[PDB]
Protein backbone atom coordinates (compact mmCIF):
# COMPACT_ATOMS: atom_id res chain seq x y z
CA UNK A 1 0.00 0.00 0.00
CA UNK A 2 0.86 3.72 -0.31
CA UNK A 3 1.79 5.78 2.85
CA UNK A 4 1.20 9.78 2.69
CA UNK A 5 2.29 12.01 5.19
CA UNK A 6 1.08 15.44 6.10
CA UNK A 7 1.06 18.19 9.09
CA UNK A 8 -0.77 21.35 8.62
CA UNK A 9 1.91 22.50 11.01
CA UNK A 10 4.52 23.32 7.99
CA UNK A 11 2.41 26.31 6.61
CA UNK A 12 3.53 28.22 9.86
CA UNK A 13 6.87 28.90 8.02
CA UNK A 14 6.14 32.51 6.00
CA UNK A 15 7.10 35.92 4.58
CA UNK A 16 6.44 38.58 7.13
CA UNK A 17 7.44 41.09 4.67
CA UNK A 18 6.03 39.83 1.20
CA UNK A 19 2.99 37.41 1.92
CA UNK A 20 2.48 36.65 -1.96
CA UNK A 21 5.96 35.63 -2.14
CA UNK A 22 5.70 32.30 -4.21
CA UNK A 23 6.83 29.82 -1.96
CA UNK A 24 3.40 29.81 0.24
CA UNK A 25 2.01 28.14 3.08
CA UNK A 26 -0.94 26.61 0.66
CA UNK A 27 1.22 24.78 -1.71
CA UNK A 28 0.91 22.18 0.81
CA UNK A 29 -3.17 22.52 1.99
CA UNK A 30 -3.80 22.96 -1.58
CA UNK A 31 -1.97 19.39 -2.58
CA UNK A 32 -3.57 17.38 0.76
CA UNK A 33 -7.08 19.05 -0.32
CA UNK A 34 -7.06 17.78 -3.85
CA UNK A 35 -6.00 14.45 -2.81
CA UNK A 36 -9.02 14.39 -0.35
CA UNK A 37 -10.88 15.70 -3.31
CA UNK A 38 -9.85 12.79 -5.68
CA UNK A 39 -10.43 10.46 -3.16
CA UNK A 40 -6.61 9.54 -2.86
CA UNK A 41 -6.46 10.45 0.74
CA UNK A 42 -8.67 7.51 1.90
CA UNK A 43 -6.84 4.90 0.24
CA UNK A 44 -3.80 5.76 1.75
CA UNK A 45 -1.98 4.74 5.07
CA UNK A 46 -0.86 8.09 7.26
CA UNK A 47 2.16 8.58 8.44
CA UNK A 48 2.84 11.07 11.21
CA UNK A 49 5.41 13.69 11.18
CA UNK A 50 7.72 14.30 13.42
CA UNK A 51 10.64 16.27 13.77
CA UNK A 52 14.16 15.49 12.89
CA UNK A 53 16.64 15.44 15.18
CA UNK A 54 19.37 17.66 15.34
CA UNK A 55 22.00 14.65 15.10
CA UNK A 56 19.95 13.60 12.18
CA UNK A 57 20.36 16.80 10.17
CA UNK A 58 23.94 16.27 10.64
CA UNK A 59 24.05 13.52 8.80
CA UNK A 60 24.76 16.51 5.92
CA UNK A 61 24.87 19.51 7.70
CA UNK A 62 27.07 20.90 9.75
CA UNK A 63 26.92 22.00 13.18
CA UNK A 64 27.18 25.80 12.26
CA UNK A 65 24.83 25.70 10.16
CA UNK A 66 22.51 23.57 12.28
CA UNK A 67 23.14 26.47 14.84
CA UNK A 68 22.34 29.25 13.22
CA UNK A 69 19.04 28.20 11.24
CA UNK A 70 17.91 27.17 14.95
CA UNK A 71 18.96 30.71 16.72
CA UNK A 72 16.45 32.22 13.90
CA UNK A 73 13.70 30.44 16.39
CA UNK A 74 13.99 33.45 18.50
CA UNK A 75 15.32 36.09 16.53
CA UNK A 76 13.40 39.23 16.16
CA UNK A 77 11.48 40.77 13.12
CA UNK A 78 14.70 42.92 11.65
CA UNK A 79 17.14 40.13 12.67
CA UNK A 80 15.60 37.36 10.92
CA UNK A 81 15.77 39.85 8.09
CA UNK A 82 19.37 40.44 8.58
CA UNK A 83 19.84 36.54 8.77
CA UNK A 84 17.61 35.67 5.53
CA UNK A 85 19.44 38.10 3.63
CA UNK A 86 22.63 36.47 4.26
CA UNK A 87 21.19 33.56 1.78
CA UNK A 88 20.43 33.33 -1.58
CA UNK A 89 16.89 33.65 -2.27
CA UNK A 90 15.71 32.70 1.24
CA UNK A 91 13.07 34.39 3.73
CA UNK A 92 12.92 33.57 7.61
CA UNK A 93 10.60 33.76 10.22
CA UNK A 94 10.28 32.08 13.60
CA UNK A 95 8.51 29.41 12.77
CA UNK A 96 10.91 28.44 9.89
CA UNK A 97 13.07 25.96 11.67
CA UNK A 98 10.21 24.13 13.15
CA UNK A 99 8.97 23.63 9.59
CA UNK A 100 11.95 22.03 8.10
CA UNK A 101 12.46 20.16 10.91
CA UNK A 102 9.36 18.30 10.28
CA UNK A 103 9.82 18.38 6.64
CA UNK A 104 13.11 16.04 7.05
CA UNK A 105 11.74 14.00 9.92
CA UNK A 106 8.32 13.31 8.21
CA UNK A 107 10.32 12.29 5.11
CA UNK A 108 12.61 10.20 7.91
CA UNK A 109 8.82 8.64 8.47
CA UNK A 110 7.86 7.65 5.05
CA UNK A 111 11.14 5.82 4.12
CA UNK A 112 11.34 3.92 7.41
CA UNK A 113 7.70 3.18 6.87
CA UNK A 114 9.14 1.69 3.28
CA UNK A 115 11.73 0.26 4.83
CA UNK A 116 10.27 -1.78 7.24
CA UNK A 117 7.32 -2.90 4.87
CA UNK A 118 5.18 -1.25 6.40
CA UNK A 119 4.31 0.58 2.85
CA UNK A 120 5.37 0.20 -0.71
CA UNK A 121 5.88 3.18 -1.42
CA UNK A 122 5.03 6.81 -0.13
CA UNK A 123 4.29 10.53 -1.12
CA UNK A 124 5.45 13.53 1.10
CA UNK A 125 3.38 16.78 1.34
CA UNK A 126 6.41 19.12 2.89
CA UNK A 127 7.75 22.36 2.84
CA UNK A 128 9.85 24.02 2.95
CA UNK A 129 11.87 22.91 0.11
CA UNK A 130 15.67 21.34 0.42
CA UNK A 131 17.71 20.18 -2.25
CA UNK A 132 19.10 23.89 -2.67
CA UNK A 133 20.51 23.97 0.87
CA UNK A 134 24.32 22.36 1.21
CA UNK A 135 25.90 21.10 3.90
CA UNK A 136 27.01 24.77 5.07
CA UNK A 137 24.31 26.85 4.12
CA UNK A 138 20.70 27.49 3.26
CA UNK A 139 19.55 28.53 -0.63
CA UNK A 140 16.28 28.78 -2.74
CA UNK A 141 13.75 28.92 -0.44
CA UNK A 142 15.24 25.63 1.11
CA UNK A 143 16.65 25.65 5.08
CA UNK A 144 17.97 21.54 5.29
CA UNK A 145 18.06 19.19 2.19
CA UNK A 146 15.47 16.94 3.11
CA UNK A 147 15.76 14.32 0.60
CA UNK A 148 19.96 14.48 1.05
CA UNK A 149 19.21 13.72 4.41
CA UNK A 150 16.68 11.46 3.78
CA UNK A 151 18.79 8.97 1.77
CA UNK A 152 21.81 9.04 4.56
CA UNK A 153 19.02 8.18 7.15
CA UNK A 154 17.65 5.23 5.11
CA UNK A 155 21.40 4.12 5.07
CA UNK A 156 21.51 4.78 8.59
CA UNK A 157 19.05 2.46 9.44
CA UNK A 158 19.95 -0.35 6.71
CA UNK A 159 23.51 -0.34 5.80
CA UNK A 160 26.25 2.64 4.28
CA UNK A 161 26.39 0.93 1.18
CA UNK A 162 22.46 0.93 0.56
CA UNK A 163 22.55 2.15 -2.66
CA UNK A 164 19.60 5.15 -3.28
CA UNK A 165 18.83 6.53 -6.23
CA UNK A 166 17.54 10.07 -6.17
CA UNK A 167 15.63 11.58 -8.81
CA UNK A 168 15.15 15.35 -9.09
CA UNK A 169 12.61 16.02 -11.41
CA UNK A 170 12.02 20.04 -9.78
CA UNK A 171 12.80 22.64 -12.76
CA UNK A 172 15.63 23.47 -10.58
CA UNK A 173 19.13 22.22 -10.18
CA UNK A 174 19.99 20.32 -6.93
CA UNK A 175 22.83 22.24 -6.34
CA UNK A 176 23.01 20.76 -2.91
CA UNK A 177 22.11 17.53 -3.35
CA UNK A 178 24.59 17.26 -6.29
CA UNK A 179 27.16 18.40 -4.07
CA UNK A 180 26.06 16.32 -0.52
CA UNK A 181 26.70 13.16 -2.76
CA UNK A 182 29.57 14.24 -5.24
CA UNK A 183 32.37 11.85 -4.31
CA UNK A 184 29.69 9.06 -3.45
CA UNK A 185 29.02 5.82 -5.34
CA UNK A 186 26.22 4.44 -3.11
CA UNK A 187 24.07 7.58 -3.94
CA UNK A 188 22.68 8.20 -7.43
CA UNK A 189 21.93 11.20 -8.55
CA UNK A 190 19.74 12.20 -11.72
CA UNK A 191 18.87 15.52 -11.96
CA UNK A 192 16.79 17.09 -15.34
CA UNK A 193 16.92 20.64 -15.05
CA UNK A 194 16.45 24.17 -16.76
CA UNK A 195 19.52 25.24 -17.07
CA UNK A 196 20.34 28.51 -19.99
CA UNK A 197 24.22 27.80 -19.88
CA UNK A 198 24.13 29.39 -16.20
CA UNK A 199 21.33 31.67 -16.86
CA UNK A 200 18.48 29.88 -14.71
CA UNK A 201 18.46 29.76 -11.23
CA UNK A 202 20.97 28.70 -9.10
CA UNK A 203 23.08 30.35 -11.97
CA UNK A 204 26.14 27.55 -11.68
CA UNK A 205 27.97 25.55 -14.04
CA UNK A 206 28.15 22.94 -11.54
CA UNK A 207 24.64 21.97 -13.15
CA UNK A 208 26.45 20.94 -16.53
CA UNK A 209 26.12 18.03 -18.36
CA UNK A 210 29.90 17.03 -18.17
CA UNK A 211 29.46 17.37 -14.10
CA UNK A 212 29.75 13.52 -13.74
CA UNK A 213 30.88 12.97 -10.31
CA UNK A 214 34.38 13.08 -8.09
CA UNK A 215 36.62 9.69 -7.21
CA UNK A 216 34.75 6.87 -6.58
CA UNK A 217 31.32 8.86 -7.39
CA UNK A 218 32.75 9.78 -10.85
CA UNK A 219 30.27 8.58 -13.10
CA UNK A 220 27.05 8.59 -10.16
CA UNK A 221 26.23 12.38 -10.51
CA UNK A 222 24.29 12.74 -13.63
CA UNK A 223 22.95 16.01 -14.74
CA UNK A 224 20.61 16.72 -17.66
CA UNK A 225 20.25 20.24 -18.50
CA UNK A 226 17.98 22.22 -20.55
CA UNK A 227 18.72 25.00 -23.11
CA UNK A 228 16.66 26.94 -25.54
CA UNK A 229 13.07 27.75 -23.87
CA UNK A 230 10.01 25.63 -23.09
CA UNK A 231 10.34 21.86 -22.85
CA UNK A 232 6.96 19.26 -21.92
CA UNK A 233 6.11 16.09 -21.71
CA UNK A 234 8.12 14.87 -25.18
CA UNK A 235 11.52 15.92 -23.66
CA UNK A 236 10.97 14.41 -20.08
CA UNK A 237 9.72 11.39 -21.85
CA UNK A 238 12.69 11.19 -23.53
CA UNK A 239 14.96 11.61 -21.00
CA UNK A 240 13.55 9.17 -19.24
CA UNK A 241 13.60 6.63 -22.34
CA UNK A 242 17.66 7.38 -23.17
CA UNK A 243 19.07 7.99 -19.74
CA UNK A 244 17.22 7.79 -16.28
CA UNK A 245 15.71 4.59 -16.60
CA UNK A 246 18.71 2.86 -18.56
CA UNK A 247 21.23 4.04 -15.61
CA UNK A 248 18.70 3.82 -13.24
CA UNK A 249 18.02 0.04 -13.87
CA UNK A 250 21.99 -0.35 -14.59
CA UNK A 251 22.68 1.28 -10.75
CA UNK A 252 19.91 -1.06 -9.24
CA UNK A 253 18.55 0.84 -6.59
CA UNK A 254 17.21 -0.59 -3.09
CA UNK A 255 15.86 2.53 -2.72
CA UNK A 256 13.93 5.47 -4.94
CA UNK A 257 13.99 9.30 -3.85
CA UNK A 258 12.19 11.59 -5.76
CA UNK A 259 12.77 15.37 -5.53
CA UNK A 260 9.71 15.91 -6.98
CA UNK A 261 9.54 19.74 -7.72
CA UNK A 262 6.50 20.27 -9.87
CA UNK A 263 7.78 23.43 -11.05
CA UNK A 264 8.72 22.34 -14.76
CA UNK A 265 4.86 21.83 -14.80
CA UNK A 266 2.39 23.74 -17.35
CA UNK A 267 1.38 27.02 -15.69
CA UNK A 268 4.33 27.32 -12.96
CA UNK A 269 5.46 31.21 -13.22
CA UNK A 270 9.27 30.41 -12.56
CA UNK A 271 10.05 27.16 -14.68
CA UNK A 272 8.54 28.32 -17.90
CA UNK A 273 8.05 24.67 -18.84
CA UNK A 274 4.69 22.39 -19.56
CA UNK A 275 4.86 18.94 -18.13
CA UNK A 276 1.67 17.79 -17.68
CA UNK A 277 0.08 16.10 -15.03
CA UNK A 278 -0.10 12.92 -17.05
CA UNK A 279 3.33 13.74 -17.98
CA UNK A 280 4.19 13.47 -14.06
CA UNK A 281 2.29 9.96 -13.82
CA UNK A 282 4.43 8.48 -16.45
CA UNK A 283 7.11 9.47 -14.67
CA UNK A 284 6.50 8.26 -11.58
CA UNK A 285 5.01 5.18 -13.10
CA UNK A 286 8.32 4.91 -14.98
CA UNK A 287 10.29 4.86 -11.91
CA UNK A 288 7.96 2.02 -9.72
CA UNK A 289 9.60 -0.07 -12.11
CA UNK A 290 12.79 0.32 -9.68
CA UNK A 291 13.99 -0.88 -6.20
CA UNK A 292 10.81 -3.57 -5.84
CA UNK A 293 8.42 -0.44 -6.22
CA UNK A 294 10.49 1.04 -3.33
CA UNK A 295 9.41 4.53 -4.34
CA UNK A 296 9.78 7.65 -1.64
CA UNK A 297 7.97 11.21 -3.48
CA UNK A 298 9.05 14.19 -1.53
CA UNK A 299 7.87 17.69 -2.44
CA UNK A 300 10.71 20.36 -3.60
CA UNK A 301 9.70 23.36 -5.62
CA UNK A 302 6.24 24.17 -7.25
CA UNK A 303 4.78 27.50 -7.54
CA UNK A 304 1.28 27.36 -9.49
CA UNK A 305 -1.17 25.88 -6.44
CA UNK A 306 -3.75 24.19 -9.56
CA UNK A 307 -0.49 22.93 -11.34
CA UNK A 308 1.03 21.27 -8.02
CA UNK A 309 -2.22 19.84 -6.96
CA UNK A 310 -3.17 18.14 -9.52
CA UNK A 311 0.29 17.06 -11.02
CA UNK A 312 1.02 15.74 -7.52
CA UNK A 313 -2.30 13.71 -7.02
CA UNK A 314 -1.32 11.95 -9.71
CA UNK A 315 1.98 10.78 -8.63
CA UNK A 316 0.43 9.35 -5.85
CA UNK A 317 -2.78 7.97 -8.34
CA UNK A 318 0.37 5.71 -9.75
CA UNK A 319 1.81 4.91 -6.60
CA UNK A 320 -1.35 3.37 -5.64
CA UNK A 321 -1.28 1.09 -8.84
CA UNK A 322 -4.14 2.83 -11.27
CA UNK A 323 -3.50 2.63 -14.67
CA UNK A 324 -1.42 5.81 -16.26
CA UNK A 325 -3.71 8.02 -18.54
CA UNK A 326 -3.28 8.30 -21.97
CA UNK A 327 -0.52 10.43 -23.28
CA UNK A 328 5.30 12.20 -25.80
CA UNK A 329 2.90 13.37 -27.96
CA UNK A 330 5.47 15.15 -30.36
CA UNK A 331 9.12 15.49 -31.81
CA UNK A 332 11.78 17.01 -29.32
CA UNK A 333 13.05 20.61 -29.62
CA UNK A 334 16.14 20.29 -31.34
CA UNK A 335 17.81 22.03 -28.08
CA UNK A 336 16.58 18.73 -26.06
CA UNK A 337 18.22 16.19 -28.80
CA UNK A 338 21.56 17.90 -28.17
CA UNK A 339 20.84 17.77 -24.52
CA UNK A 340 20.11 14.21 -24.31
CA UNK A 341 22.99 13.40 -26.56
CA UNK A 342 25.50 15.48 -24.69
CA UNK A 343 24.57 13.67 -21.31
CA UNK A 344 25.03 10.11 -23.44
CA UNK A 345 28.47 11.32 -24.67
CA UNK A 346 29.64 12.32 -20.83
CA UNK A 347 28.31 9.07 -19.18
CA UNK A 348 29.29 6.22 -21.54
CA UNK A 349 32.52 5.92 -20.20
CA UNK A 350 30.62 5.08 -17.19
CA UNK A 351 27.11 3.06 -17.93
CA UNK A 352 27.15 0.24 -20.38
CA UNK A 353 23.66 0.88 -20.61
CA UNK A 354 24.06 4.07 -22.78
CA UNK A 355 27.02 2.24 -25.57
N1 LIG B 1 13.35 33.83 -7.38
C1 LIG B 1 12.07 34.30 -7.56
C2 LIG B 1 11.49 35.03 -6.51
C3 LIG B 1 10.21 35.58 -6.57
C4 LIG B 1 9.44 35.40 -7.71
C5 LIG B 1 8.05 35.93 -7.87
C6 LIG B 1 7.37 36.73 -6.79
C7 LIG B 1 7.38 35.68 -9.07
C8 LIG B 1 8.00 34.95 -10.08
O1 LIG B 1 7.39 34.72 -11.15
O2 LIG B 1 9.27 34.45 -9.95
C9 LIG B 1 10.02 34.63 -8.83
C10 LIG B 1 11.31 34.12 -8.73
K1 LIG C 1 16.20 19.01 -10.90
K1 LIG D 1 26.75 10.67 -6.38
ZN1 LIG E 1 12.62 24.42 -8.09
Redesign the pocket.
Known amino acids: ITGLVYDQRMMLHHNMWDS???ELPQRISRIFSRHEELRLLSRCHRIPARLATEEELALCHSSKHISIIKSSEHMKPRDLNRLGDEYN?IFISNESYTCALLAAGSCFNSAQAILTGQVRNAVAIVRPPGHHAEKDTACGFCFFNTAALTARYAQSITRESLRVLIVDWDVHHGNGTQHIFEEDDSVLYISLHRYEDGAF?PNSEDANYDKVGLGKGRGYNVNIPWNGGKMGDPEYMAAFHHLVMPIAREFAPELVLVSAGFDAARGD??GGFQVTPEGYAHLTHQLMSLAAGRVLIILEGGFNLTSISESMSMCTSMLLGDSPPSLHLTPLKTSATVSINNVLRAHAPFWSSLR
Open positions: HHPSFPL
